[PDB]
Design a protein around this ligand. Structure first.
Ligand SMILES: CCCCCCCCCCCCCCCCCC(=O)OC[C@H](COP(=O)([O-])OCC(O)COP(=O)([O-])OC[C@@H](COC(=O)CCCCCCCCCCCCCCCCC)OC(=O)CCCCCCCCCCCCCCCCC)OC(=O)CCCCCCCCCCCCCCCCC
Ligand SMILES: CCCCCCCCCCCCCCCC(=O)OC[C@H](COP(=O)(O)OCCN)OC(=O)CCCCCCCCCCCCCCC
Ligand SMILES: CCCCCCCCCCCCCCCC(=O)OC[C@H](COP(=O)(O)OCCN)OC(=O)CCCCCCCCCCCCCCC
Ligand code: HEM
Lengths: 55, 431
């Protein structure tokens, strides 16, 4: 909390971190895509989808 | 050495050629698979087989003459080969055992034995062959609900449901005199010109062929029979060709022969060729080509058949062939056209002038029924040198550019993308 009161360092650090974090989100979601690609996406029927697929 | 035609009741044609010495005389009926309904398919096959068995046994035992046949879409090319000095006997047998009488032929026993033999033959054709199967499927899927998609062999369900009456009914509705001719390719001169017209030597069933209500159409489709048991793959593109008797037959034939055949396991084929063959050969993509542009009296088919070995690399083969077809319709080098002209010239020379009289007889029959008069290859050579780049550009701008395709293959096609990755990329968005 940057001290004993809400002051310049508080909001300064909050804004800098806010401007930083979404790129870390972007990194995590490229990991999300990586982890997804290993085994496709689930059928709505909850059954094997390896039979047929469309491009 | 000039083909002669006339019209005296039954059309008689003759392509004299004293080069070979295997005289052949027969008939070429202007009907077949196209002239018959889906529910009774293999009637023509059954006719051809009963002939080819029992009449063969009769003729060889009696005299010396080997009889063949052929059915492609609308022929029954019952050619009866013979010696040069033995044509009268062949004609007498043909008119005494094919047109009439059919009682000594269609015994129940012989018919049933031939029926089971036909069933076995069509079955093992279905279980063994593959390129022919995909070609038949391509026809059956291009012309849905039309008296041209049904195959030239038939289906077991349609084969089993016919005994005598259907066969005789088709005989009396298609073995007439209006659309039946006589062909005498070989080394006869005018004996056939006068002996066909005799006191009684004439086909029965005077009248006319029943006209089909609908002729032909086209529509894009797929018939794939994906089964991973088979080792290789099989595909066959198609684009609607040009029907016979049109000022586009030869230009389409050239537009097909530009890319040409290819056999990846031959030392004398990989080295030669044009762009697609090199760009395939850098890796291993395909194993066979067949650019074929087949034409029929109702509509024709311009096709592209392969039987590859690689399974993961189907998409790249298709993509390259499509880009090459686009290149054909956008820009062609003059040397490519000249090479195609020369190759197509030699190909026609080989095909129409093969020493075997049966091939020439069948082709003459086809042309005389469809064109109405034989087109001697001299005129073909005269009119083939006039084909020029502008003409091919114009023709491909119509038949090829953004036109619906039909493909149908049996095997491990699964890698093939369904429709919009093989259709909406015939223009590559930059013409
Ligand atoms: C998301 C992805 C969607 C696009 C993918 C797609 O259509 O794939 C099929 C197709 C598959 O490629 P292919 O079958 O290998 O290509 C054969 C053709 O020659 C492909 O045609 P090509 O060789 O002409 O492709 C190169 C170039 C691609 O255009 C460019 O982006 C280069 C400029 O083609 C054009 O479409 C250029 C003309 C259009 C310009 C429009 C300008 C808009 C701004 O790819 C494309 O059509 C790519 C289009 C790219 C356009 C921009 C995509 C942005 C993505 C974000
Ligand atoms: C100035 C800068 C811009 C220059 C633009 C030049 C346009 C032509 C580019 C090459 C096309 C060509 O080379 O096309 C001429 C040859 C002719 O092949 P073919 O017709 O004999 O095949 C016989 C059947 N037609 O195609 C090829 O080899 C194709 C080779 C593969 C394609 C590669 C294309 C990559 C570059 C695309 C550029 C598009 C813009
Ligand atoms: C994951 C990302 C999801 C969001 C992506 C949205 C934009 C990409 C769409 C590209 C479609 C395409 O590029 O389409 C390419 C197809 C090609 O036809 P074809 O593919 O059959 O040719 C394939 C073989 N030749 O032409 C069209 O569609 C034309 C219509 C284009 C409409 C563009 C609309 C733009 C909306 C932008 C929305 C905001 C972003
Ligand atoms: C920016 C954040 C995210 C992005 C960009 C993203 C993107 C995607 C994409 C592209 C897919 C493929 C199918 C689809 O588009 O829905 C997908 C699927 C999926 N995502 Fe996400 N995702 C995100 C967040 C999350 C989160 C937070 C969860 C769970 C906590 C999640 C769970 C899943 C699951 C379970 C699937 C399953 C698809 C399947 O089973 O069919 N995602 N996501």
């Amino acid at each position: 909390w940057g001290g004993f009161s809400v002051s310049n360092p508080t909001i300064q650090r909050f804004f800098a971190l806010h401007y930083l974090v979404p790129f870390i989100i972007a990194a995590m979601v490229i990991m999300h895509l990586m982890a997804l690609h290993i085994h496709g996406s689930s059928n709505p029927l909850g059954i094997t989808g390896n039979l047929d697929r469309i491009p | 050495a000039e083909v002669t035609q006339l019209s005296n009741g039954i059309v008689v044609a003759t392509e004299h050629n004293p080069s070979a010495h295997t005289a052949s005389v027969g008939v070429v009926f202007g009907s077949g698979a196209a002239n018959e309904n889906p529910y009774n398919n293999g009637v023509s096959n059954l006719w051809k087989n009963i002939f080819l068995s029992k009449e063969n046994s009769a003729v060889a035992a009696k005299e010396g003459l080997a009889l063949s046949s052929n059915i492609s879409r609308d022929f029954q090319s019952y050619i009866v080969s013979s010696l040069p000095g033995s044509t009268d006997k062949s004609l007498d047998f043909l008119n005494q055992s094919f047109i009439q009488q059919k009682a000594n032929l269609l015994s129940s026993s012989n018919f049933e034995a031939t029926k089971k033999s036909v069933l076995k033959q069509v079955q093992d054709f279905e279980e063994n062959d593959h390129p022919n199967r995909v070609l038949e499927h391509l026809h059956s899927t291009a012309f849905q609900n039309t008296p041209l998609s049904l195959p030239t062999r038939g289906t077991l369900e349609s084969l089993e449901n016919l005994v005598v009456a259907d066969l005789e009914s088709f005989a009396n509705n298609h073995f007439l005199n209006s659309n039946a001719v006589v062909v005498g390719t070989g080394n006869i001169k005018h004996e056939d010109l006068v002996n066909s017209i005799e006191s009684k030597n004439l086909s029965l069933q005077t009248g006319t062929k029943p006209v089909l209500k609908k002729k032909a159409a086209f529509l894009g489709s797929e018939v794939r029979l994906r089964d991973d048991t088979l080792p290789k793959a099989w595909i066959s593109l198609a684009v609607e060709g040009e029907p016979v008797n049109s000022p586009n037959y030869f230009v389409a034939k050239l537009a097909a022969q530009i890319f040409g055949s290819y056999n990846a396991f031959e030392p004398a084929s990989r080295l030669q060729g044009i762009k697609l063959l090199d760009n395939i050969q850098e890796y291993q993509l395909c194993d066979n080509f067949n650019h074929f542009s087949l034409s029929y009296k109702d509509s024709g088919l311009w096709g592209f058949s392969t039987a590859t070995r690689n399974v993961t690399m189907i998409d790249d083969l298709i993509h390259f062939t499509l880009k090459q077809w686009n290149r054909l319709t956008i820009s062609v080098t003059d040397t490519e056209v000249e090479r195609a002209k020369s190759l197509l010239k030699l190909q026609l020379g080989q095909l129409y002038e093969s020493g075997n009289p049966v091939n020439d007889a069948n082709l003459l029959g086809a042309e005389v029924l469809i064109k109405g008069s034989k087109l001697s290859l001299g005129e073909a050579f005269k009119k083939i040198d006039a084909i020029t780049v502008k003409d091919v550009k114009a023709w491909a701008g119509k038949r090829l550019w953004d036109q619906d395709i039909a493909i149908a293959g049996t095997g491990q096609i699964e890698g093939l993308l369904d429709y919009m990755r093989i259709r909406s990329d015939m223009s590559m968005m930059r013409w």
